[PDB]
Every structure is written in structure tokens, then in C-alpha cells.
């Protein structure tokens, strides 16, 4: 029989947290199925409502002098007449309608699609809603601004962003390598490095949803609910990273047949920098592409699939698409518990619980939690289902054919 | 050679804090650069100079000192009083021109002429150790109330007027105001080009052969012997070298009454009369080892191509064949050897110093009348300094409007001789393969030419090339007891390699004790 | 086994630093982890709220005769009404009904972006550039108009840029080295064959050079405020946060430009040796490595040029000229002279010298912490690369794998 999901009890059902009025259990998953046996999609955390035990600990605090922004983000009063939405719902501007005094008073300046979506939350196992915890529409009344050289448009820089430098760095590498005494290997890479962001480490202005979801975290270690948090916003955020696009293609040859279907690489290199029908192993390239507006990359694939090296026009088209749909080439992730606003009620214990929840995330959802393959194959957790793959023309759901 | 090992950067301890300078309320100190990170290596975290705030516990008067002549508050700039209310702010505070309701003091309407474009670079100091511009030494904008003007010979710019039908030349650029620090600025169009090109080729080829056949019958024997050689040599050599030098103006800086820059003025007022290497080294660092007093403005183009090829082939054979009969029998025996080798190197360097990124690039790529003409046009709007004479920074002090600075000048000379010793690229390690050693801040590099690679350029991609040596620097001065002090140096950093030339300088240098 | 990275225990908590109401801790990375052991993602420092135990000392002082803007910068009163936004906020001039006394005397003038971005911050780790700590919009009320050189336009030089000279240079270097051998000779004999080619080309274009002012420089409000927030007590994680936000150095001078590079390498060879000693050798190789790089200029021209360089196609010089001109629209900091960021700590600031010394220590820590020095040796002389919270090894030799374990 295959391995149907192995799981655990509704253990240690808590007492109530007084202010949240709720009680939790931290269930567990024990084997992620295997061999096309029943995958795991049960919950790992459970809760129930409470009639409250005792007083709530006066958890509220309020601005004092500082502006009682309608969604509770106390903001410096020089913002009050900003006209720049520094309060998360315009209730600053709604409260100071009487006189405008706009930052960027005279400069024609815009907001970058990159900057708004800068500093994505990332889950080390997947992806997330509310991807940016950062506000990135808060400017703190400043007009720090940066120019895209490709359009000369000024984009103002939202206050979470400590640097935003636009670039154009493009590389391509074509490597072919063979030996006998034998091996054959070949890769192609390109990179189109559009620009670099760096984020502020301190006084980060987090969204109202994020602070509400830190109010929704019990001061006691309810692993299920902290998992709900880590899955929603992220295990980590990108503190700095390089936006752009990338691709790699590979096509490895049987040298023996290569020498007689074709003759030599110049027979094919002449197509890059007249053809024979039999040599197609060089043509059936494996392709990987990251980022870029899909239409141009699809057209590239539609040419490469025919063994036609794409024209320079299509490459530049794709590149000038990249600005419309970039991806992070490179990042330095930092864990979300750093974003925990230091003054938040009990902020520190909640950070420490987040550290435990991060650890439990790793310890739980890892290939260590699955047995060995039927015969030396590789088992991968994929979407949370341990199943097997082997490169060397193995076959079967556990590489049982050899 | 394999790479040398890395060395860590090292600095001495802090020198003892300089006593708080009354007008500054600042304390200063310096370290010494005991070692730059010649290769790899941790860079030093820290700067070799440091300053801190203080309180003097004593006033200073110096704001009043010059006040016979008009002394600004912001700056030490002390002006002949006719410059007050002259109509042109002569110190950055403008205190000479505020409240000038007695406007009758204006000297002339001259502001219709802009300053000479690109005059500011001649005002900058120069660092011989890095060939980099420093801060300004000369004031680029002080006119001393003169309206002295330079004719721009290239003022002709086409215009069109659709309201008429006239194509005509505009005249705005026709004259520039000459800043006071230029004794001469002199527009003059010259070009020169030189081209040399050479080919030498030789192909030398010899074949030689003998066949010797002998036959006898008594039973019989027949024998044939062969010896043969082919030996072919080819050499191909091509050299071409182009130089083009446009001159568009010449300048000369005034040798007298030099009006120093506000920043140099203040910084020179801050240095002690007592010798303090930290202070004066900071001054030389900021304002450079040298300042400029001659000019050519222009553009240069240089092109070099060398190609060298060789081929050698040889084949040899020696053989014997025999037959005999008594039953008949046949034998043969011999050897043959063959070799071929082929070599080519092609090296090209093109460089443009001049007036636009676009056509400097285009002319660097494709030498042609189109790129020559369009780059020459760009030289109209952005000429570059093509030649300059310079002298050590301290010689400026002799000629300032500040009068004598003998002690400060001798201090600055001593400090310069130490600065030119301590930061010399000698302390960057052996750049192999004719790599160029560079020292910047507390760190070292080799700039490695394309035929060379690695932290010391040590791995040429070919098996090797003829690479000339370079000197280590001079050792310390001898602790002289006779009237003579001595300094030694050797051509070993690296030594001349693969038959390269010796470095040409002096082995031995000598000084009065 | 590979090694999942390891970190020290937390430091003891600092005392509560007053005014900033916080306590801090530190935790060094003992071993980066390597060979696909887990990253050290975890933060090197921690901080916590504290109710302050003792009186705070104010950060403000009365500047005296200088005006004191909303942003806290003080400006000499000739800059009142000057209309240059000398405080970044207009409290230099928003007060003024009349007599704006404006510099540049109604002359045509522009802002230059190259001057505005001059003096980028730099993190020594990776040499990555960062926003300039300099304001570059304060003009000290001077005009100092300079010509764009590549264009008939005059821009006002910002006060902190002591020079910005468009001393344009364009270079091209090309080398080809090409080599073939055939040899058919102890009692050895041969059939060695080789076919070798190196082609290498690079072209730098220099648009110009800036020099930042050595004295009397004016810094951004956010930078000086972040120095204010910087703990006096040498809390490594807070100084690392500062260095991460602004880098460890600034470019006190920089050359702006663009670059193209192309390397073509081939090595096709075989060996046979036979004979007797007083022998059955065979081998073959092919290596064939193409790399192309473009830096700077606008995408639309840059990538076309990178392609036409990768193609053997003869470049239409119009394309090269187009990219080289587009470098003026999007230059790269192709070179710079670094100075430590702590030299930008303004003197006469409270505890300025202490914050400077503590930044120098924090830089020592930052360099030695993320240095591969404390990382495991590669197995076969490969270069160890501290990538990001993990070391991996790469061999230029024929060895292979993340530790060069094999060939």
C-alpha cells in the first residue's frame, strides 16, 4: 500500500486569552503521504470562542498629542495638512482640508510601480497575500525622488525605501563543454538587471492590516494561529534586491551521434553568430525564463522551439517588456519578526513567538518528515506531497523502473 | 609566478591630540599607513586622519585682523575696497555687495559675457600620485573687478528664421569673460596627425632529399635507402600607430597676486605654523600634490594596432627497403617524424579624449572621415585639457595675495616629501605582465591589461610574454653621520621577466645630511 | 554532512538608553553554514522597549543667530527668503512676502541629475551603490552655472559638488591570441593536437567626474536624524542597521560612464602518447566560453548593442554612437574614490566623536562578520564565495561541485 497521510491529535486545548476571548489547539502533520498515497491537506491549527475569564489587561494605548489617525497609526502632525495620505485612509487630509501645502510642491513626479510593490513578503515555502506588509504610499512629507533614465520620468521614493537606483546591466553567457578519455554539457544564461532597491531598517511604516494582525496574535504560543500569520504575510521580507529578468537554456548532445548527424558546432553556431534535418537534439532546448511580460517570452519560446535563435528584435522587445513585469533577481531576506513595531503591546513576546513559529514551520514542512524512496530515488515535498523524481531515465512514481 | 599571498591593511596608533585651535575649537590627529592591503586582504576600517570638537578656553580675534582691507565674515577673503559695492559679489557671503545703496560704486556692466566654459578645471589642484583632480586651488570665478574678455573664434552657430528666408549666424558665444587667475587664455585652432604603418614578412622554406639504390646478383640482393627533410618557417609582422592632436585654446595661469579659492584660503588659515604632518598631509590630500600653470585645450585621438604571426612546420623521413632471393624474401624498416605549430597575436588600443560620449565612442570604434568630423564638431562644445604644466602645490604660496608664508611653505614642502613617500604605489605589490599598480586611500589594486588576469595580473592567458620590471621604491634614508645621506632602490618589483627590459630609473639617490 | 549555520547566544541586554527608550542585544554568526546547509537569515541584533530610568538629555540646541527650520537644519540668515528651499522644507522662504533676493539673476538655469545623485553611499560588501547622503539641493545661495558639455544646457552646480567636469574619454581595447599545434614524435611518441583562441574586447566610455566637497558640506535631514537616533553605547546591531541603510563608505569622488565587455575563449585539444619507459595515454577536451556584458546607457540601445556585439555582424557605428550618447541619460558609477561613512558624522554634533569611533568599530565588525575568513575551506583549491548567509565553492579548474568535491 501507498502511504496515506499520518497526523496527530487536537492536543493541549488552551484556556482563553482574556482580550481576544479565544482558545486554540496546535495540531500536527506526521507524514506528508507518499507514493501517490493520500496527500495531506488537513488543518494544523484549531480554535474556539470563549466567554471571557477575567478582565482584559487595558491593552489600548493612544497617541496623545500625535494625530489619532482613523486607523490608529499615530503620525507626526506636520503631516496633518500633508495632502499626501500619510494617514492610511486620508483621514489626515479629511481632517486638514482647509489649506493645501503639498510636498513636491512644484516638481512633476510620479510613483513607481516597483516602489509601491517594493519589499515583498516571501514565504520560504511559497507565496502570500497582502504580499507587501510595507505601506509604500507614505511619504512622510518628503520629496525624495529618483529619475528613470529610460523615460526621464521622476518617481518619488516612498519613505520605506532608503535607496532606489535604476540601472541597465545586461549579460549573456554561452558555454559548451565536452571531454573524452567522456562528458557533454552546455548552458546559456542571460541577465537583464533593471535596478536596485534598499529598504529602511527602522521606523518602518507597516500597513494597518499588519498591525491589526499583530493585535490578532495571542500573547501565548498558539502555533496554529501564528502559522496563519506566517502564511498570510510571510516568513521573510526582501530588505534589498535587484529587479529585472533572467533566462537560461540548456541542450546537451550525444557526441557520437552529434559527429555524424551534424558534423561540428559551426554547423549550428552559424545560426547564432544552412541546416540539416537529422540533428535535432541540439534543437529541442530545455528553457527556463524568469520575469518579463509573458507575450514576448512566449514569442521567444515559439521561435526557439523550432530551433530558430530568436532575432535581436524579439530580445529587445522582451527586455523593454521587463519594465512592465519585473522579478527579483536577487534578495536579502530578513525575518518578519523584525518588522514587529517595538512599541506594540507586548511586542517582544510576540516577536519570540514568531521566532518559534518560524522554526516550527521549518521543522514541520521538510523532507526529513518523509521516509526513503523505494530504491534510492529522490523524494520532494512539492506542494506538500512527498513524491519522487529521478533524472537518469528512471521511471515510476518511486523510480521503481531502473 | 603564482599570486603573492594577501596582506592585511595596517595603521599605526593615533598620534596625540593636537591642542584645541582657538578659532576652530577643533582637535586633530593622524595615523600612519603601515601597510595597504596589497592583495586580497582586509581593508582598514578607519581613516588615517581624525578630528573632534573642543573648547579652546581662549578667544581669537582673527575676524578683525585684515580689516584695513575689506574682510568678509564667512571667509578670509580680504578685498581691495573698490571691490566693495563693485556690482559683483567677490566673496561667497556677498558682504561686499549687501546694503550697497551707493550703487554708484559699480565698476562695469560685464555680465553680458559668461566665464570661459571649461575654465574651472584649470583651477583645480592635481594629485601626481593618482593623476586625479583635487579641490579647487585657484578661484575660478573671481575677476578682481576687471572686465577682460576673450574672443571665441568658433562663435558662428547657424540659425534659421522662417519669418524671413535667412540662414544666419548667431553671436551670443562671441566673447567670454576671462577669470582673474588667467594671465592668458588664447583660442587657436591647430591640428596635427602622424601615422606610421609597417609590414615585414618572411617565408623561408627548404626541402632536401636523397634516394640511394644498390642491387647485386651472385642469389640476389636489392636495397633502397631514403632520407628526406621538409622545413618551413613563416614570420608576419604588422605595426600601425596613429596620433591626432587638435588644439583649440591655450591658457596660462597668473604668476602673481594669485587669488586662492575660498576653501583653500580657509584651510590654509587653519594650518599651524608649527609642523604637524597630520594637518599638512590632510591639506595635500584635499588640494593635491600639484597645481597647474599651463594649458592646452583640445582633443586627442590615438590608435595602435600590432599583429604578429608565426608558423613553423617540419617533416623528416628515413627508410630502408630490401629484397633478396636464395625462396625470396622482402623487408622494410624506417621512421618518420612530423611537427606543426602556428601562433597569432592581434592587439589594438584606441582612445579618444575629447568632446562627446557619443562620438568619442564612435571614433574609438571606427576611424573614418564621418567620425573624425563629428568628433571634431563635438570638440567645439566640450574641449578637454590635452597638456598641462604643473608645479608642487607649495609654490602657489609664494605668489598669493596673502604675502609671505615661509614657515607654512617649508612645512608644506616637508609634508609633501613625506606624502609622496608614504602613499606611493610602490606599496601596491608586483603587478605582473605589465599591469599598472595603483594606490587609492588605504588600498591597492593592479589595473590588469587584457592579456593578464588575477589579483596581481599574474596569470596571462598565454604561456607568457616579455614583461619589463619595475622598481620597488627607495628604502629609508640612511642614519647619516658623514655629511651625506643615502637611499637605495632596485629593479625587482617585479624583476624584468621573460627577457623584458630593466626599469630605467636610478639605483642610488643622495641627500645632504 | 553539510552544516546548517550556527550563531552565538545573545549578548546580555544593554542598559536602557534614555531618550530612545530601548535596550539592545547582539548575536554573532559563528559559522555561515555551507554546502546547502540552512542560511543564517536570523537577525544579528535585537532591541526591546524600556521605560527610561533616568533623565533624558535634549538633542536640540539653539543655533543662536542662524534660523532653525522645521527640519532642524540651521541656515545663515542671508538664505532667508532666498527661495532655494535651503532647508529642504521651504521655511527658509515660506515666511517671506517679498524681496525674494533670488540667485542666478533671472538667467537660464537647470537642475542637473548627475550633480543631484553625486556622492552615492556605498556598502563595501559587493561595492553596491546607495543614495547620496548629500542633499545636493542646498545651493548655499550661489549660482555656479556649468555646461552639460554633451548638450548646450547650463545647470546650477549644487554646493556639495565641488567639481563636476565632463572630461569625456572613450576607449576600445581588443586582443586576439590564436594558437595551433600538431606534434607527431624515454621511448615516447606523440600525436598531440591543439587549437586555442582567446578574444577579449572592452570599451569604457567616461562621461565625466564629480568631486565632493571636503568641508562645510550639508547632509540630508534623514541622515543626520539617523545619526541622532544612533545609540551612543555601541550597540552593534543598530550600527549595522545604519551601515545597511547608508553603506560603510561614500564616494568622495566618482567617474560616471558606461562599459561594454566581451570574452570569447576556445580550447580544443587532444593527446596521445605511446612507447616504453626506462605508455598508453589518450585524452580529449573542448572548452568554449562566451561572456558579454553591457553597463549603462538606456535599455533600448544597450541591449541592441550587446546583441550586435554577440553577433559577428559588423557594428553600424550609428548604434554604438546611439548607446554612447544614451550613457548621458543613464550613466553608471564606473569608478569611485571611497571614504568611510563616519567622516560624514557632523562635527560639533553631540558625542560626534563617540559616534564616529563606534561607527569605525561597527565597520570593523561588519567586515569581519560577513567575511569568508570564518568559513570552511574548499576541498580542492576552489574559491569559496560567501553568497548570502552561506558559503559555496566554485573552481576555475576542472574540479566541480559546490565544494569542488569532484571533477
UniProtKB/Swiss-Prot annotation, chain A:
Carbohydrate attachment residues: 10, 13, 275
Transmembrane segments: 265-272
Outcome after substituting residue 55 to E: Does not affect inhibition by the antibody aE11
UniProt keyword annotation of ATP-binding present: no
Tissues and organs where the protein is expressed, per its UniProt entry: Plasma (at protein level).
Classification via Pfam families: Ldl_recept_a (PF00057), MACPF (PF01823), TSP_1 (PF00090)
LDL-receptor class A domain: residues covered: 61-98
Domain annotation MACPF: ranges: 100-369
A GO term from the CC aspect: membrane attack complex
InterPro entries noted in UniProt: Growth_fac_rcpt_cys_sf, LDL_receptor-like_sf, LDLR_class-A_CS, LDrepeatLR_classA_rpt, MAC_perforin, MACPF, MACPF_CS, TSP1_rpt
Membrane topology: Multi-pass membrane protein
CDD domains the UniProt entry points to: LDLa (cd00112)
GO BP term, pick one: complement activation
Domain EGF-like: 370-400
Location of this chain's protein in the cell: Secreted; Target cell membrane
Family: Belongs to the complement C6/C7/C8/C9 family.
Clinical condition linked: Complement component 9 deficiency: A rare defect of the complement classical pathway associated with susceptibility to severe recurrent infections predominantly by Neisseria gonorrhoeae or Neisseria meningitidis. Some patients may develop dermatomyositis.
Self-association state and partner proteins as the record states: Homooligomer; about 20 C9 chains oligomerize to give rise to a huge beta-barrel that forms a 100 Angstrom diameter pore in target membranes. Component of the membrane attack complex (MAC), composed of complement C5b, C6, C7, C8A, C8B, C8G and multiple copies of the pore-forming subunit C9.
Physiological role: Pore-forming component of the membrane attack complex (MAC), a multiprotein complex activated by the complement cascade, which inserts into a target cell membrane and forms a pore, leading to target cell membrane rupture and cell lysis. The MAC is initiated by proteolytic cleavage of C5 into complement C5b in response to the classical, alternative, lectin and GZMK complement pathways. The complement pathways consist in a cascade of proteins that leads to phagocytosis and breakdown of pathogens and signaling that strengthens the adaptive immune system.
Protein name per its UniProtKB record: Complement component C9
Species: Homo sapiens (Human)
GN (gene name): C9
Curated annotation (Swiss-Prot), chain B:
Gene3D superfamilies: Low-density Lipoprotein Receptor, Thrombospondin type-1 (TSP1) repeat
Domain of life: Eukaryota
Site (Not glycosylated): 13
GO cellular component, one term: plasma membrane
Single GO term (MF): complement binding
Ranges for domain LDL-receptor class A: 64-102
Subcellular location per the Swiss-Prot or TrEMBL entry: Secreted; Target cell membrane
Location of the MACPF domain: 105-427
InterPro entries listed in its UniProt record: C8A_B_C6_EGF-like (IPR048831), Growth_fac_rcpt_cys_sf (IPR009030), LDL_receptor-like_sf (IPR036055), LDLR_class-A_CS (IPR023415), LDrepeatLR_classA_rpt (IPR002172), MAC_perforin (IPR001862), MACPF (IPR020864), MACPF_CS (IPR020863)
One GO term (biological process): complement activation, classical pathway
Biological function: Component of the membrane attack complex (MAC), a multiprotein complex activated by the complement cascade, which inserts into a target cell membrane and forms a pore, leading to target cell membrane rupture and cell lysis. The MAC is initiated by proteolytic cleavage of C5 into complement C5b in response to the classical, alternative, lectin and GZMK complement pathways. The complement pathways consist in a cascade of proteins that leads to phagocytosis and breakdown of pathogens and signaling that strengthens the adaptive immune system.
PANTHER family given in the database record: COMPLEMENT COMPONENT C6, COMPLEMENT COMPONENT C8 ALPHA CHAIN
Protein's name according to its UniProt entry: Complement component C8 alpha chain
Taxonomic source organism: Homo sapiens (Human)
Swiss-Prot record, chain C:
Top-level taxon in the UniProt lineage: Eukaryota
Domain called TSP type-1: residue spans: 4-57
Gene name of this polypeptide: C9
Membrane topology: Multi-pass membrane protein
PTM info: Thrombin cleaves factor C9 to produce C9a and C9b. Phosphorylation sites are present in the extracellular medium.
Impact when changing residue 291 to C: Creates an artifactual disulfide bond that prevents the conformation change required for oligomerization and pore formation
Oligomeric and partner information: Homooligomer; about 20 C9 chains oligomerize to give rise to a huge beta-barrel that forms a 100 Angstrom diameter pore in target membranes. Component of the membrane attack complex (MAC), composed of complement C5b, C6, C7, C8A, C8B, C8G and multiple copies of the pore-forming subunit C9.
Species the sequence originates in: Homo sapiens
InterPro entries, A to Z: Growth_fac_rcpt_cys_sf, LDL_receptor-like_sf, LDLR_class-A_CS, LDrepeatLR_classA_rpt, MAC_perforin, MACPF, MACPF_CS, TSP1_rpt
Name the record gives this protein: Complement component C9
Biological processes per GO annotation: cell killing; complement activation; complement activation, alternative pathway; complement activation, classical pathway; killing of cells of another organism; positive regulation of immune response; protein homooligomerization
Residues with attached carbohydrate: 10, 13, 280
UniProt KW keywords: Age-related macular degeneration, Complement alternate pathway, Complement pathway, Cytolysis, Disease variant, Disulfide bond, EGF-like domain, Glycoprotein, Immunity, Innate immunity, Membrane, Membrane attack complex, Phosphoprotein, Secreted, Signal, Target cell membrane, Target membrane, Transmembrane, Transmembrane beta strand
Locations listed in the record: Secreted; Target cell membrane
Domain EGF-like: 375-405
Cystine crosslinks: 5-40, 16-50, 19-56, 63-74, 69-87, 81-96, 104-143, 375-391, 378-393, 395-404
Residue span(s) of domain MACPF: 100-374
Chief place where the protein resides: secreted
Similarity comment: family membership: Belongs to the complement C6/C7/C8/C9 family.
Reported tissue expression: Plasma (at protein level).
Pfam families membership: Ldl_recept_a, MACPF, TSP_1
Amino acid at each position: 500500500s501507498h502511504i496515506d497521510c499520518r497526523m496527530s491529535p487536537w492536543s493541549e486545548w488552551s484556556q482563553c486569552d482574556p482580550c481576544l476571548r479565544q482558545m486554540f489547539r496546535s495540531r500536527s502533520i506526521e507524514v506528508f503521504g507518499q507514493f501517490n498515497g493520500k496527500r495531506c491537506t488537513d488543518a494544523v491549527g484549531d480554535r474556539r470562542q470563549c466567554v471571557p475569564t477575567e478582565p482584559c489587561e487595558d491593552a489600548e494605548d493612544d497617541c496623545g498629542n500625535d494625530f489619532q489617525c482613523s486607523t490608529g497609526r499615530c503620525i507626526k502632525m506636520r503631516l496633518r495638512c500633508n495632502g499626501d495620505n500619510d494617514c492610511g485612509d486620508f483621514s489626515d487630509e479629511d481632517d486638514c482640508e482647509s489649506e493645501p501645502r503639498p510636498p513636491c510642491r512644484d516638481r512633476v513626479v510620479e510613483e513607481s510601480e516597483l516602489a509601491r510593490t517594493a519589499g515583498y513578503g516571501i514565504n520560504i515555502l511559497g507565496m502570500d497575500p497582502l504580499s507587501t506588509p510595507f505601506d509604500n504610499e507614505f511619504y512622510n512629507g518628503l520629496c525624495n525622488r529618483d529619475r528613470d533614465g529610460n523615460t526621464l520620468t521622476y518617481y518619488r521614493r516612498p519613505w520605506n525605501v532608503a535607496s532606489l537606483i535604476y540601472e541597465t546591466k545586461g549579460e549573456k553567457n554561452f558555454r559548451t563543454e565536452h571531454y573524452e578519455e567522456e562528458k557533454m554539457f552546455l548552458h546559456v544564461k542571460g541577465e537583464i538587471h533593471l535596478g536596485r532597491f534598499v529598504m529602511r531598517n527602522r521606523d518602518v511604516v507597516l500597513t494597518t492590516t499588519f498591525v491589526d494582525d499583530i493585535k490578532a496574535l495571542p500573547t501565548t504560543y498558539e502555533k496554529g494561529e501564528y502559522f496563519a500569520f506566517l502564511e498570510t504575510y510571510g516568513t521573510h521580507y526582501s530588505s534589498s534586491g535587484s529587479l529585472g529578468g533572467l533566462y537560461e537554456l540548456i541542450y546537451v548532445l550525444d557526441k557520437a551521434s552529434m559527429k555524424r548527424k551534424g558534423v561540428e558546432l559551426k554547423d549550428i553556431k552559424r545560426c547564432l553568430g544552412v541546416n540539416i534535418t537529422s540533428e535535432n537534439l541540439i534543437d529541442d532546448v530545455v528553457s527556463l525564463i524568469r520575469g518579463g511580460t509573458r507575450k514576448y517570452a512566449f514569442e521567444l519560446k515559439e521561435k526557439l522551439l523550432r530551433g530558430t535563435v530568436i532575432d535581436v528584435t524579439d530580445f529587445v522587445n522582451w527586455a523593454s517588456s521587463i519594465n512592465d513585469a519585473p522579478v527579483l533577481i536577487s534578495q536579502k531576506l530578513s525575518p518578519i519578526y523584525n518588522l514587529v513595531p517595538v512599541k506594540m503591546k507586548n511586542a517582544h513576546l510576540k516577536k519570540q513567538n514568531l521566532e518559534r513559529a518560524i522554526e516550527d514551520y521549518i521543522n514541520e514542512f521538510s523532507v526529513r518528515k518523509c521516509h526513503t524512496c523505494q530504491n534510492g530515488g529522490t523524494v520532494i515535498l512539492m506542494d506538500g506531497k512527498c513524491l519522487c523524481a529521478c533524472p537518469f531515465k528512471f521511471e515510476g512514481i518511486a523510480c521503481e523502473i531502473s | 609566478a603564482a599570486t603573492p599571498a594577501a596582506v592585511t591593511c595596517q595603521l599605526s596608533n593615533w598620534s596625540e591630540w593636537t591642542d584645541c585651535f582657538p578659532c576652530q575649537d577643533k582637535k586633530y590627529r593622524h595615523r600612519s599607513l603601515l601597510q595597504p592591503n596589497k592583495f586580497g586582504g582586509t581593508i582598514c576600517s578607519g581613516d588615517i586622519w581624525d578630528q573632534a570638537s573642543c573648547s579652546s578656553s581662549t578667544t581669537c580675534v582673527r575676524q578683525a585682523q585684515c580689516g584695513q582691507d575689506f574682510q568678509c565674515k564667512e571667509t578670509g577673503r580680504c578685498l581691495k575696497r573698490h571691490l566693495v559695492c563693485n556690482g559683483d559679489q567677490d566673496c561667497l557671503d556677498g558682504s561686499d555687495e549687501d546694503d550697497c545703496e551707493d550703487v554708484r560704486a559699480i565698476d562695469e556692466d560685464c555680465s553680458q559675457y559668461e566665464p570661459i566654459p571649461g575654465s574651472q578645471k584649470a583651477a583645480l589642484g592635481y594629485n601626481i600620485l593618482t593623476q586625479e583632480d583635487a579641490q579647487s586651488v585657484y578661484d575660478a570665478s573671481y575677476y578682481g573687478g576687471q572686465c577682460e574678455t576673450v574672443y571665441n573664434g568658433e562663435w558662428r552657430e547657424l540659425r534659421y528664421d522662417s519669418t524671413c528666408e535667412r540662414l544666419y549666424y548667431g553671436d551670443d558665444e562671441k566673447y567670454f569673460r576671462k577669470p582673474y587667475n588667467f594671465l592668458k587664455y588664447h583660442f587657436e585652432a591647430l591640428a596635427d596627425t602622424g601615422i606610421s604603418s609597417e609590414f615585414y614578412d618572411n617565408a623561408n622554406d627548404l626541402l632536401s632529399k636523397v634516394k640511394k639504390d644498390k642491387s647485386d646478383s651472385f642469389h640476389s640482393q636489392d636495397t633502397s635507402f631514403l632520407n628526406e627533410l621538409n622545413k618551413y618557417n613563416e614570420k608576419k609582422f604588422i605595426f600601425t600607430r596613429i596620433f591626432t592632436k587638435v588644439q583649440t585654446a591655450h591658457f596660462k595661469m597668473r604668476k602673481d597676486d594669485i587669488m586662492l579659492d575660498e576653501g583653500m584660503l580657509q584651510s590654509l588659515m587653519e594650518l599651524p605654523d608649527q609642523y604637524n604632518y597630520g594637518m599638512y598631509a590632510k591639506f595635500i590630500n584635499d588640494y593635491g600634490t600639484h597645481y597647474i600653470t599651463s594649458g592646452s585645450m583640445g582633443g586627442i585621438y590615438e590608435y595602435i594596432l600590432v599583429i604578429d604571426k608565426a608558423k613553423m612546420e617540419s617533416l623528416g623521413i628515413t627508410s630502408r627497403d630490401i629484397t633478396t632471393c636464395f625462396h625470396c624474401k622482402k623487408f622494410g624498416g624506417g621512421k618518420t617524424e612530423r611537427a606543426r605549430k602556428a601562433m597569432a597575436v592581434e592587439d589594438i588600443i584606441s582612445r579618444v579624449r575629447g568632446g562627446s560620449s557619443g562620438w568619442s565612442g564612435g571614433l574609438a570604434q571606427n576611424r573614418s572621415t564621418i567620425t573624425y568630423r563629428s568628433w571634431g564638431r563635438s570638440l567645439k562644445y566640450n574641449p578637454v585639457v590635452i597638456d598641462f604644466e604643473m608645479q608642487p602645490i607649495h609654490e602657489v604660496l609664494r605668489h598669493t595675495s596673502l604675502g609671505p608664508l615661509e614657515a607654512k611653505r617649508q612645512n608644506l614642502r616637508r609634508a609633501l616629501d613625506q606624502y609622496l613617500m608614504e602613499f606611493n604605489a610602490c606599496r601596491c605589490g608586483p603587478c605582473f605582465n605589465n599591469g599598472v599598480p595603483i594606490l587609492e586611500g588605504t588600498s591597492c589594486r593592479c589595473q590588469c591589461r587584457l592579456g593578464s588576469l588575477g589579483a596581481a595580473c599574474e596569470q596571462t592567458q598565454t604561456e607568457g610574454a616579455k614583461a619589463d620590471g619595475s622598481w620597488s621604491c627607495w628604502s629609508s634614508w640612511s642614519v647619516c653621520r658623514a655629511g651625506i645621506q643615502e637611499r637605495r632602490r632596485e629593479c625587482d618589483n617585479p624583476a624584468p621577466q621573460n627577457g623584458g627590459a630593466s626599469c630605467p630609473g636610478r639605483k642610488v639617490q643622495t641627500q645632504a645630511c
